[PDB]
Structure formats: structure tokens, C-alpha cells
């Protein structure tokens, strides 16, 4: 139990805190007190100063992951064995499921990179057509949609606090990663979009649908109303730290009967995630220092109906 | 091409209510924002509040207890009160102009921004310091020219003893002169009093009896006198 | 809290640290002042300056983080004598109600500037008020470092032995006063009276008797 | 580090330890490498 509250700032958008905490050094009896910094939703209060407790140590335990480790995402090729084989389809109109009249015999998967994302895919695949998507079936609202582009739209996600660290050492060879002072201003978590593309590529995702509820009918869309705080918005991996941003600008439209202008989009940065909805032991992300700036290439997104309600109507 | 000048009337008791004002007369104050700043000797400088042509109002950490400043439309200027005042709070004070930039780090939605309020032009500024004592004027002496160094050049002032603060005029002839001008700011004394000397310097040839006349005022006592002088 | 010193030598130009130095992007503003009257400005952004000031002076402007805002003085004259306020806006401190501390200056490499004195008698009508007393002048004397000493003619006097310290006019050199209180009876009593300046390691000062 | 005296192990430095269990020895002895059929 680890004492903290607000960071220095003219108050103004929890945006962090600054803990300065009891530990054990490496030697045993010997202990130390030191400080690092920590974000709202890493840790839930109880009672004085003030001071809270880890959101995850009411459940569960973490194994920080080590830094040497990265989770930068490259292309897998799944095989299958001798005695056996995979196969392709070559039809770029094919939806979902059925048999597939172009077809090409492969044994290993062309580069899948498994990025790791919620409600968006990225940096995937792109079909040479107009953005044809299936489900599992789309008469029920309860099976999800999965779109995926035929151009990609570029995504920037940006923090610009360049954060320090110390190396600090717990034990007999254990070194915790407290992240460090901040030296610079304070800038939060958001992601660029440029609507023109969007609006567009949107556009094309717009009238094809439509050949499921008729030519004639109503479309929608606002933000995400249900569940918990990681999948309710974009969670995802960006050189080190997962970003959570709500999509509010972008489910923005209603387009019925047929300068740069760049969306920005504020996220928050986790550090300890219980992922896969997996309840167990955590892991605790190691911070990043300086700068980031990631670039992506939208090709894909899941979406699911809500179900009951007056047919067609709305 | 905006311009100050600022009116004290003189030191006010203490545990008491200042009152300074500080004309302009160079367009509308409407539209922009004069604030306050404090020089006290052997101590820095210290800035202590503002307020807006829409009203919003601020004042300094260690003095916000009981400062309040609010301004007239009809007079183009402010108006400063305060209550309880300290002998500390001795001080020169200049109505403050501060023109304000934006800054920002960023792009605004976010956030983005502290303003900075930085100052351009400010006045010559106008004395109060804080005592309990009353208002008197000064002493009038002429001390007569030496008959100083070879002719040409000889010398000759006007002597001002006992008056109450150490900010008076003292004008020649109305201002018709100013060369060779050197009025010496005063030196106080045990008894508690400002004694000044200011004198110009002259020339033997120059001599003799043209009508020179030291004119002095001071505005607490609201004295107005001149003094001819002669060897 | 109070004054912190910096000195330059006549012709050419130095730095000038700050205290008080910024946590995120800066905003510093100026304040050139001269004990007594207005504080001019010298810049408003670390970038820019008001109009009228020489193209001189400049702070240097936020790029990066790694700046720390310094000021370079070129020319240096004894017009540049003064105190200056180094006035912080930064990115999260919070309102910025105090300037920065108190800096000194003064330009050295201008040598001296010799006193020149002046000297004359109570009045013709103080005498009557029963009182008498002669002030000393002396003018255009660097450094302001001086001592007067008054002189009972084989006797000082150590009695009102008052006078100003140096301070100074628009001609960038310093003045000063010293104030005699006197009897009227004394007065005629003695031959002549002096008050005779130190000022440097030199001496220049003559004396005045009654009529 | 600091008393009367005392110290602190080496590797507390930098390491965690595991004592070898007195049961295993490390008496060496003659160990055959082999290739497989095949090769
Ligand atoms: C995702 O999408 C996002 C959405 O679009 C997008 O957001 C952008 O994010 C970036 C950062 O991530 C933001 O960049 C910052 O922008 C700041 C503001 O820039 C704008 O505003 C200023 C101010 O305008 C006023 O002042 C000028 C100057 O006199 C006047 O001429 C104006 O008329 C105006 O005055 C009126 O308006 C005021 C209100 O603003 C009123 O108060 C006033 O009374 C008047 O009514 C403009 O000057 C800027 O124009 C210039 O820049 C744009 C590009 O930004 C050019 O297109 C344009 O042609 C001009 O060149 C612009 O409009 C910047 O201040 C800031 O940069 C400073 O700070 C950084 C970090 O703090 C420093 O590293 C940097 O050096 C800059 O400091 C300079 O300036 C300061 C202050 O002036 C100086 O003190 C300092 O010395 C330094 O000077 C140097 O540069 C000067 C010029 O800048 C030069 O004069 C000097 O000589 C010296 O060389 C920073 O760049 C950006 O604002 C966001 N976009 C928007 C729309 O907000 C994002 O990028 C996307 N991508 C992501 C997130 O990855
Ligand atoms: C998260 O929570 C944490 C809580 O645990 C926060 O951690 C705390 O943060 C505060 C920040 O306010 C720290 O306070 C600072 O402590 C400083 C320690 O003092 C050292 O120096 C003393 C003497 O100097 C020796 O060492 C210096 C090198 O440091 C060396 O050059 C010198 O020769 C000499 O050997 C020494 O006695 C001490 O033991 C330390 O070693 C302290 O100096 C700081 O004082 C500042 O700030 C105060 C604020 O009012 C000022 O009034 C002071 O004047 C002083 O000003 C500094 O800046 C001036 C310029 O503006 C300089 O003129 C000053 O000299 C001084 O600058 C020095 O250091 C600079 C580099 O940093 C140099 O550039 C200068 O040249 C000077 O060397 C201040 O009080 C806590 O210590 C810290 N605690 C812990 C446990 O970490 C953390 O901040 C929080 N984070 C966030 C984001 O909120
Ligand atoms: C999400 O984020 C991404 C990434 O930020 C965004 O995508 C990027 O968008 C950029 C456009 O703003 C684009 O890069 C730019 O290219 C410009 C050139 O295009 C213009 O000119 C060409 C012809 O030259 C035209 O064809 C074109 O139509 C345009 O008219 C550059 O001008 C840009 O800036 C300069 O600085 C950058 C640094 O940021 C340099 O990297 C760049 O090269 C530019 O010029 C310097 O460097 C070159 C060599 O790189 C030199 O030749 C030149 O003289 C300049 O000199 C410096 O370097 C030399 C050494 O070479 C040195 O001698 C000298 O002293 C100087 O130091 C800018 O680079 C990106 O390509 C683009 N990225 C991607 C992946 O698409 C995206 O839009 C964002 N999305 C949203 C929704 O926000
Ligand atoms: C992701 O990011 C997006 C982007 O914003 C977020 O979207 C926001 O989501 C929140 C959900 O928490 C929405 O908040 C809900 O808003 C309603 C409306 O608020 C009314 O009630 C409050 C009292 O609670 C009033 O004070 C409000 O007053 C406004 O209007 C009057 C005049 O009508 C005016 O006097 C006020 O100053 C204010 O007006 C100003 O702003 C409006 C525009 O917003 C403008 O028209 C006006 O001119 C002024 O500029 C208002 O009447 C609110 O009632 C809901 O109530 C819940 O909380 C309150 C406590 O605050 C409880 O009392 C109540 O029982 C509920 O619990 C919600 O707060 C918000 O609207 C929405 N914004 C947008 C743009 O979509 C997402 O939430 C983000 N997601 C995550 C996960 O972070
Ligand atoms: C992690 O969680 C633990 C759980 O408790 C937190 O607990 C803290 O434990 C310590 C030690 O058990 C508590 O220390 C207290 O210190 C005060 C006052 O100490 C001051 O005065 C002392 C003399 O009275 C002096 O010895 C102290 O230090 C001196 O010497 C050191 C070097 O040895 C030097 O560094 C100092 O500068 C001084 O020179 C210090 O000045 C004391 O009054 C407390 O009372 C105990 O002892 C008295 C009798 O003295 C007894 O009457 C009481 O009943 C009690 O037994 C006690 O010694 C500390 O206070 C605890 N924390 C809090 C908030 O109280 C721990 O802090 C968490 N974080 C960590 C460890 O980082
Ligand atoms: C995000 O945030 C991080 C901060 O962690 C930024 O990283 C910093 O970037 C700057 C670039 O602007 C780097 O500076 C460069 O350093 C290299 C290498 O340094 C050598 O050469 C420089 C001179 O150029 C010299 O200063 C260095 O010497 C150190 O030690 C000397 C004594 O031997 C001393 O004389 C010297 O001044 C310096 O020590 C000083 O600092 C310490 C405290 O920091 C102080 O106690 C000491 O007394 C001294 O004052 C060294 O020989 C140079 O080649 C470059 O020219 C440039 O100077 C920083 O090093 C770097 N810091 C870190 C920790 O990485 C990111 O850039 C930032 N990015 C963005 C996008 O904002
Ligand atoms: C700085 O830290 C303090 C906490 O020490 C923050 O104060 C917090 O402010 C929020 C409102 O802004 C309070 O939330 C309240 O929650 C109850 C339900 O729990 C709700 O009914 C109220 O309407 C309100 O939303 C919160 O209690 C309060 N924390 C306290 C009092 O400990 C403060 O917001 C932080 N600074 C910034 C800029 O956020
Ligand atoms: C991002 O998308 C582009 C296509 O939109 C992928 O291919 C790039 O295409 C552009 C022109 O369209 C070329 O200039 C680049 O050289 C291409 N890059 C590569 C790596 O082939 C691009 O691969 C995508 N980025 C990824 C997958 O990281
Ligand atoms: C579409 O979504 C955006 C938010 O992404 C809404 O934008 C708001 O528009 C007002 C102007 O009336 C701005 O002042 C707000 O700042 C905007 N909000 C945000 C969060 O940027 C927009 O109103 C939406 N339009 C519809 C019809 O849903
Ligand atoms: C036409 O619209 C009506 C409701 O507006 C809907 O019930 C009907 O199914 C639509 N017909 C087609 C062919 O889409």
C-alpha cells in the first residue's frame, strides 16, 4: 500500500498520479522507499493522504513481461504436414462460406501477423474488390460482423511525453521497471484519422449492406453501449504500451436513401492487463521512454448488431 | 502612443484603505486589461492581480486577504482600494499594462494551453510609503553664488530642508530652464525628515539679475512656493 | 529573495543564468529594471521583442527541450546598469505569481570618473530661524564609492554627519549629498569649516568662512 | 557495506541462488556420445 495522489499539472484534464512507496531491497530486513508513476486505472483506492491499491490485486497475480521480449507483431506462416495440406480461395467476390470455384493449392499460409486489436483490424490482408463481409449469420444481431477494406486508411496513435525509467533492483536478481520522471509537457494518448478517407471508405462499406436489408432502408451508428472498459474501446499494442481511445468521432453517420479535417482520437495507456478475458496471473507492460509515434493501415473492423426491435423500420 | 500617470494622495493610517488611480489617455480601456506592480527598496519587485473589461477577477497568493480593484468606463482608468495596511507595504507602485499572448503546446481541443501576460508600457510611477505622521511644508533657503571656477562658469542652487515625503517638484522658472540641471535627491535625518539641495550651474558673465526663481510644491501640505535668489 | 550578481567587462558581451528553470515548454517573459523608475521591456516572447528596443538582445527560443532561456549583451555600455526580473510561464507549473530573482549588473572596464565638488554657505535668512547648516555637493564620480569627513578647522566635527550613498542620475554616473546640522552660534564662532571627500586614493576639496 | 562488522553475500548483488542437492555428485564420469542411424 503505496501512497499518491494527482501529478503536478494546472488542473485541468485521472490523468496520473506519483506514487513514493515501500519496497525491499536486495537485501532481506533492509527496505527503501522511492517513487514512480502510475496511471488511474492501474490501481482503486480503499480508504487517507490518499492511497489506493492495484485494480488486479483484488484478483489475481503478474508477471511483468520482460522488456527484452518485444510484441511487435510479424507474419506466421501456418503449415499443415505431410499426409496432408491446407488450400486457398482465389475469388475475390466470395463471401463467407461456400465452395469456391478459383482455387489454388498452398501447404503454408502467406505472412499472417497476429496484431493483437478490438474492434479494429489493421496492417492485415486486403481484398482486391469493394469490401464484401460476412458473419456467421447476419439475420441474428448476436454474431458478429468483420469488415475489411479494399484501400487502407492511415492511423497514427500518439503520446508525446517522453517517459524515463529506472532499473531498480527488488531481490536476488529481480530489477522492477519503475517508470521515472517526466521531463516536458503533459500530452495524452489520441490518434489521428483523416476523414476524407474515411467518410469515403466508410462510404463504400455504406451501400453494400445494403444488399441484405434492401435497397431502401435505414443505416446507423454512435459508440460502443456494453461491457467492460478494455474491449468497450480500441485495445491494443503500440511499441510497448496498449492504448484504450474511445471511437466517438468516427461512429459519427446516417447516410440514407444513397483543410485535412483529421479525427483525433484521446486514449488511455494501460500497464497491467488481464487479456484474452483470461482471469489469472497479469502482466504488468514495462513503460516506453521518449517519444512514440506508430503509423497503421486500416484494412478491417467487427461489429454486432443489437437485436430487437421493429423490422426494417429502424 | 498610450500614456499614464498616476495619483496618490499621500499615506494613508494603518489598518486602513488605500485609494490610487492612474489616468490614460491613449484609447479604450474596454478593450484591453492595466494591472499593478509594487518596487519596494532593498526588496524585489512583485506583481498582485487583475481583472477584465468582462469582469474577471484575480489576486496574489500572499495578499489576496483584502485587495479589490474595480474600474470606471466614463473615466478611462483604474481604481485600486485596499484595507489594512502595513508600514511594509511602503511603496512606489506602477499601473502595469500587460498585453497577453496564447502559447500552446498543441492544438487546443486537447487542452493545450497556460496564457502568458506579459507588459508593455507603464508609467513613471507615483510614491507612497506608510507612517503615522502628519503633513507640514518645506523650508525655503537661498544660498548666494561663490564670485566657483574662472569665468565663465560659477554656480548657485536653492536649498529645501524640512518637508514631508522627498517627492516634490522643484522647477526653475517654470520650466523655462533645464541645462546644467542637477536637483540632488534628499538624505533623511534622525528627526525623520527628507532635506534636499538642487542647483544649476551658471556662468560669471552670465551674472548678474536675470529673474532666475526656484519653484517648488508639494501637494500633502498643498504648499506652493518660489523664492528669488541673489548673492 | 534578493540581489544575485553578474559582471561583464566594458566592450564585450556574456551570459546571464536564471534561476527558477522551466519543467515543460517555456514562455519567459523580461522586465528590465532601474531602481525608481518604469521597468521597460526588452522581449514578451523568448522569440521577439517590443518595437523601439535595440535588434540586440534576444532569449533564446523554445525548439526543443534542452533549451534553458540565456540572454547575450552585446555593446555593453554603462547604459545596461541595471537589475532585471526574469519572469517564468511554463507548461504545468501553475500561475506564475513571483518574477524571477533579483540579478545584478554592473559593467566593468570603464575607468574612473573624478568628483567635482561645490560648497556654499547657510542662508541669509536661516541664520534668523536659529539654525545653520552647509551641505556638501559633488557630482560625475565613478565608482560611487566615497567617504566625507568634515572638518572643525584642527577638529572634525562627528556631529549630524549624515549623507546619501551614491546614487545615480541619467548621465549613467552617480551622485551624492551630506547634511550638517549647525548652530548659527558655532558658526560665526569659527574661522572657516570644511567637508572633504574620499572618493578613489585621492583628494580635491577646499573649505568656506563666514561673511 | 557499513558495523560490527557485517557484510552481505556476493551474488545478492545480482543473482538468486538454488544449493545443489548433497544427494547428486559431481564425481565426473564417461560419457559416450552417439550418432543415430541415418547417420
Ligand atoms: C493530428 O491532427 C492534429 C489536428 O490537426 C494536429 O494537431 C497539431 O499538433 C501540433 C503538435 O502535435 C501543433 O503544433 C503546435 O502548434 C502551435 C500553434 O501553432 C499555431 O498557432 C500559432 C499562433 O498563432 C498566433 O500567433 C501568430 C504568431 O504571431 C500570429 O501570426 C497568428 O495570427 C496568431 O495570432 C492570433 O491568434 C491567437 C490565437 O492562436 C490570438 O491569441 C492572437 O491574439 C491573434 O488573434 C501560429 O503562428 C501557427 O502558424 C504557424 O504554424 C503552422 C503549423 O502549425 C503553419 O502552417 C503556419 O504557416 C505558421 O508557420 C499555428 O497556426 C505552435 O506554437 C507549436 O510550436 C511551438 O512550440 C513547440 C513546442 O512548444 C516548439 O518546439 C516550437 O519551436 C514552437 O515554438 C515557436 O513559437 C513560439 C511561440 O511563438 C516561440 O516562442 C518560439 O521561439 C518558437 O519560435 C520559432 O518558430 C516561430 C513560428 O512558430 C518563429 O516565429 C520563430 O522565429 C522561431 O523560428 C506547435 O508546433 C498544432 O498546433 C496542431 N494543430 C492545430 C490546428 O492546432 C497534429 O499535428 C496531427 N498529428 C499528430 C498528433 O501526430
Ligand atoms: C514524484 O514524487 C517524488 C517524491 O518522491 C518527487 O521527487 C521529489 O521532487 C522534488 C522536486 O521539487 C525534489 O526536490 C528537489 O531536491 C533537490 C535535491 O537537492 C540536491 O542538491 C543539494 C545541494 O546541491 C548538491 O547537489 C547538486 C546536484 O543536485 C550539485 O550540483 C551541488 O554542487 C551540490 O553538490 C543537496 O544538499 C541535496 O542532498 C540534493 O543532492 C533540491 O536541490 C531542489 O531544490 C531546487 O528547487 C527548489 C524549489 O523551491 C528551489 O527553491 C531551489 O533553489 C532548488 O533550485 C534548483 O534549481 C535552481 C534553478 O532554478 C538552481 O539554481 C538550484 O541550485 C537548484 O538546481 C540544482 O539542480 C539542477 C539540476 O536538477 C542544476 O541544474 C543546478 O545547477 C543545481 O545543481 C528540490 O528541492 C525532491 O528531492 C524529490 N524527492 C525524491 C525522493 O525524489 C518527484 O519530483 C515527483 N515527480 C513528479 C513529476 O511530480
Ligand atoms: C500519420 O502520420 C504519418 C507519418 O507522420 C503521415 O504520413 C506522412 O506524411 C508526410 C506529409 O506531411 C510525408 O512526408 C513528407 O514529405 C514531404 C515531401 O512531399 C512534398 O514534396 C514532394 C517532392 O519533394 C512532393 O512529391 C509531394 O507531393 C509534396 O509536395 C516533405 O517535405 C516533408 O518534410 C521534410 O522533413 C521531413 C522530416 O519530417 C523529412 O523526412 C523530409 O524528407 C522533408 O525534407 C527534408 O529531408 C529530405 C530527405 O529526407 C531532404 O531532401 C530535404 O531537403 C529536407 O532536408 C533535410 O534532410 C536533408 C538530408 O536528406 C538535410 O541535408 C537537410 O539539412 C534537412 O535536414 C515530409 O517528410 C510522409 O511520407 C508520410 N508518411 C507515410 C508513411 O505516408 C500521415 O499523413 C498521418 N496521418 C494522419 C491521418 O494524420
Ligand atoms: C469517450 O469520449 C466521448 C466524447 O465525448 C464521451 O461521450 C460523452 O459520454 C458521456 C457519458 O458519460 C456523456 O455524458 C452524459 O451527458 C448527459 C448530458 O449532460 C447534461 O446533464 C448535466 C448534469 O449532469 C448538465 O450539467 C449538462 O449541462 C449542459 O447543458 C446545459 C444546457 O442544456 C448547460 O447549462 C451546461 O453547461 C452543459 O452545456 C454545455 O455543454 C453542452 C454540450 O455538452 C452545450 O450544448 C452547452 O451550450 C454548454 O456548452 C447537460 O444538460 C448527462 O446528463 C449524463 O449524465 C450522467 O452523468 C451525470 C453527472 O454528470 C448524472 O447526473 C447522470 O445521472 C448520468 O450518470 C452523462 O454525463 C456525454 O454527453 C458524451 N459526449 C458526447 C459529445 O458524446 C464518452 O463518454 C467517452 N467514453 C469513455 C468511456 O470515456
Ligand atoms: C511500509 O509499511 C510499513 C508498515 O508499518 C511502514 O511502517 C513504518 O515503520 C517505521 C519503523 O518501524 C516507523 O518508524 C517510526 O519513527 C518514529 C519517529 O522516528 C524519528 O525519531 C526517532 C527517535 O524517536 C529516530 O530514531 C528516527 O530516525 C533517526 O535515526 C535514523 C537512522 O537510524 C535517521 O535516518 C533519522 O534522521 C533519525 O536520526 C526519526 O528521526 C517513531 O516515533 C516511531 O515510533 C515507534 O517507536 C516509539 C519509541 O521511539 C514507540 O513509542 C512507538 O510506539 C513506535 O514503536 C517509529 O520508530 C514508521 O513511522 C512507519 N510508518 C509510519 C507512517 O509511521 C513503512 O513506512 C512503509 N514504507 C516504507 C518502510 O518505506
Ligand atoms: C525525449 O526525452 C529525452 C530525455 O531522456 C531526450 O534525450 C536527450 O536528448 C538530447 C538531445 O537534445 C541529448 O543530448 C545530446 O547528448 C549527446 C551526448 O552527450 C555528450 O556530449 C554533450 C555535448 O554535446 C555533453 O553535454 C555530454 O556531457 C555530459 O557530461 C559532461 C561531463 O563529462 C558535461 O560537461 C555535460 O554538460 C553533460 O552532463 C551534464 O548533464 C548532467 C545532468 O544531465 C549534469 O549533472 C552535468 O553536470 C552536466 O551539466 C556528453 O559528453 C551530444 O552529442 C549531443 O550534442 C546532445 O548534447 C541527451 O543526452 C538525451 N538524454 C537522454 C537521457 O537520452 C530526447 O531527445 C527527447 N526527445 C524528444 C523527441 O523530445
Ligand atoms: C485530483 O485528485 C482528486 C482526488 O484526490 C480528484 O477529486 C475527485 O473529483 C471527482 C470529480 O471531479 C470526484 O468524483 C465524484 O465521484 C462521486 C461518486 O464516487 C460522484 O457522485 C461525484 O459527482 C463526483 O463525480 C472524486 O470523488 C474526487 N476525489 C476525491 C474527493 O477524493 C480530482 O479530480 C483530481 N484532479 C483532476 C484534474 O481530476
Ligand atoms: C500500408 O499500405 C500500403 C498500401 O496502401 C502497403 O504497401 C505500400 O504501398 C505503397 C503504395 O501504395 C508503397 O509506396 C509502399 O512501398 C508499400 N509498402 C510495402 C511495405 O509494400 C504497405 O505495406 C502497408 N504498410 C504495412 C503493411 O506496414
Ligand atoms: C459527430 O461526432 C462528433 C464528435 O466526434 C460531434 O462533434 C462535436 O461537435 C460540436 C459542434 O457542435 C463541437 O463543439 C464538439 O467539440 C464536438 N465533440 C467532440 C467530442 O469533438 C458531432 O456533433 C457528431 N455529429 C452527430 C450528428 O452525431
Ligand atoms: C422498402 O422499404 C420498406 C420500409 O421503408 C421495407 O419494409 C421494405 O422491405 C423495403 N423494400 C426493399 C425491396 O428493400
Known amino acids: 500500500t503505496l501512497q499518491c495522489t494527482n501529478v503536478t499539472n494546472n488542473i485541468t484534464d485521472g490523468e496520473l498520479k506519483n506514487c513514493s512507496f515501500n519496497m525491499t531491497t536486495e537485501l532481506r530486513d533492509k527496505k527503501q522507499k522511492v517513487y514512480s508513476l502510475f496511471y488511474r486505472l492501474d490501481v482503486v483506492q480503499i480508504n487517507s493522504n490518499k492511497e489506493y491499491r492495484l485494480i488486479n490485486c483484488n484478483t489475481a497475480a503478474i508477471t511483468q513481461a520482460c522488456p527484452k521480449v518485444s510484441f511487435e507483431p510479424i507474419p506466421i506462416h501456418y503449415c499443415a504436414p505431410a499426409g496432408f495440406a491446407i488450400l486457398k480461395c482465389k475469388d475475390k467476390k466470395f463471401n463467407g462460406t461456400g465452395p469456391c470455384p478459383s482455387v489454388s493449392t498452398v501447404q503454408c499460409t502467406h505472412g499472417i501477423k497476429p496484431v493483437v486489436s478490438t474492434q479494429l483490424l489493421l496492417n492485415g490482408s486486403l481484398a482486391e474488390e469493394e469490401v464484401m463481409i460476412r458473419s456467421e449469420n447476419i439475420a441474428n444481431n448476436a454474431k458478429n460482423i468483420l469488415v475489411q477494406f479494399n484501400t487502407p486508411v492511415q492511423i497514427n496513435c500518439t503520446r508525446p511525453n517522453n517517459n524515463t525509467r529506472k532499473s531498480i533492483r527488488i531481490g536476488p536478481g529481480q530489477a522492477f521497471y519503475a517508470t521515472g520522471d517526466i521531463i516536458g509537457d503533459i500530452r495524452q494518448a489520441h490518434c489521428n484519422v483523416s476523414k476524407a478517407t474515411w467518410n469515403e471508405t466508410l462510404g463504400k462499406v455504406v451501400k453494400q449492406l445494403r444488399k441484405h436489408f434492401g435497397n431502401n432502408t435505414i443505416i446507423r451508428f454512435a459508440n460502443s453501449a456494453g461491457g467492460d472498459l478494455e474491449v468497450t474501446t480500441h485495445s491494443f499494442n503500440c511499441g510497448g504500451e496498449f492504448f484504450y481511445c474511445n471511437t466517438s468521432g468516427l461512429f459519427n453517420s446516417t447516410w440514407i436513401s444513397n483543410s485535412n479535417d483529421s479525427i483525433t482520437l484521446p486514449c488511455r495507456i494501460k500497464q497491467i492487463i488481464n487479456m484474452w478475458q483470461r482471469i489469472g496471473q497479469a502482466m504488468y507492460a514495462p513503460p516506453i521512454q521518449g517519444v512514440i509515434r506508430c503509423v497503421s493501415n486500416i484494412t478491417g473492423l467487427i461489429l454486432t448488431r443489437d437485436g430487437g426491435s421493429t423490422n426494417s423500420a429502424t | 502612443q498610450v500614456q499614464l500617470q498616476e495619483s496618490g494622495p499621500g499615506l494613508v493610517k494603518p489598518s486602513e484603505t488605500l485609494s490610487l488611480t492612474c489616468t490614460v489617455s491613449?484609447?479604450?480601456?474596454?478593450?484591453?486589461?492595466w494591472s499593478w506592480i509594487r518596487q519596494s527598496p532593498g526588496k524585489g519587485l512583485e506583481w498582485i492581480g487583475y481583472?477584465?473589461?468582462?469582469?474577471?477577477?484575480n489576486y496574489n497568493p500572499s495578499l489576496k486577504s483584502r485587495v479589490i480593484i474595480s474600474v470606471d468606463t466614463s473615466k478611462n482608468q483604474l481604481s485600486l482600494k485596499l484595507n489594512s495596511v502595513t508600514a511594509a507595504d511602503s511603496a512606489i507602485y506602477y499601473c502595469?499594462?500587460?498585453?497577453?499572448?496564447?502559447?500552446?503546446?498543441?492544438?487546443?481541443?486537447?487542452?493545450?494551453?497556460?496564457?502568458?501576460?506579459?507588459?508593455?508600457?507603464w508609467g513613471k510611477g507615483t510614491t507612497v510609503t506608510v507612517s503615522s505622521a502628519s503633513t507640514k511644508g518645506p523650508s525655503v533657503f537661498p544660498l548666494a553664488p561663490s564670485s566657483s571656477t574662472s569665468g565663465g562658469t560659477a554656480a548657485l542652487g536653492c536649498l529645501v530642508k524640512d518637508y514631508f515625503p522627498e517627492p516634490v517638484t522643484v522647477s526653475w522658472n517654470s520650466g523655462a530652464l533645464t541645462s546644467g540641471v542637477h536637483t540632488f535627491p534628499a538624505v533623511l535625518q534622525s528627526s525623520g525628515l527628507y532635506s534636499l539641495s538642487s542647483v544649476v550651474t551658471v556662468p560669471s558673465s552670465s551674472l548678474g539679475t536675470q529673474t532666475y526663481i526656484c519653484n517648488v510644491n508639494h501637494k500633502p501640505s498643498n504648499t506652493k512656493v518660489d523664492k528669488k535668489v541673489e548673492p | 529573495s534578493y540581489v544575485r550578481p553578474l559582471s561583464v567587462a566594458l566592450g564585450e558581451t556574456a551570459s546571464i543564468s536564471c534561476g527558477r528553470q522551466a519543467l515543460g515548454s517555456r514562455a519567459v517573459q523580461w522586465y528590465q529594471h532601474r531602481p525608481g523608475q518604469a521597468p521597460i521591456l526588452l522581449i514578451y516572447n523568448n522569440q521577439d521583442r517590443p518595437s523601439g528596443i535595440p535588434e540586440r538582445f534576444s532569449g533564446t527560443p523554445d525548439i526543443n527541450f534542452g533549451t534553458r532561456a540565456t540572454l547575450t549583451i552585446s555593446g555593453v555600455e554603462a547604459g545596461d546598469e541595471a537589475d532585471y526580473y526574469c519572469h517564468m510561464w511554463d507548461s504545468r507549473s501553475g500561475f506564475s505569481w513571483s518574477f524571477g530573482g533579483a540579478t545584478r549588473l554592473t559593467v566593468l572596464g570603464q575607468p574612473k570618473a573624478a568628483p567635482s565638488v561645490t560648497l556654499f554657505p547657510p542662508s541669509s535668512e536661516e541664520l534668523q530661524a536659529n539654525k545653520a547648516t552647509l551641505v556638501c555637493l559633488i557630482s560625475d564620480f565613478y565608482p560611487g564609492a566615497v567617504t566625507v569627513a568634515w572638518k572643525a578647522d584642527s577638529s572634525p566635527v562627528k556631529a549630524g554627519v549624515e549623507t546619501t550613498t551614491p546614487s545615480k542620475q541619467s548621465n549613467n554616473k552617480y551622485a551624492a549629498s551630506s547634511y550638517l546640522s549647525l548652530t548659527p552660534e558655532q558658526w560665526k564662532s569659527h574661522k572657516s569649516y570644511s567637508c572633504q571627500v574620499t572618493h578613489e586614493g585621492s583628494t580635491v576639496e577646499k573649505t568656506v568662512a563666514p561673511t | 557495506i557499513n558495523s560490527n562488522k557485517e557484510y552481505r553475500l556476493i551474488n545478492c548483488n545480482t543473482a538468486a541462488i538454488t544449493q545443489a542437492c548433497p544427494k547428486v555428485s559431481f564425481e565426473p564420469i564417461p560419457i559416450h556420445y552417439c550418432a543415430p542411424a541415418g547417420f
Open positions: 491613449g484609447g479604450s480601456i474596454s478593450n484591453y486589461y
Open positions: 502595469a499594462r500587460a498585453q497577453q499572448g496564447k502559447r500552446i503546446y498543441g492544438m487546443v481541443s486537447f487542452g493545450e494551453f497556460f496564457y502568458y501576460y506579459y507588459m508593455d508600457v
Open positions: 481583472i477584465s473589461d468582462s469582469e474577471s477577477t
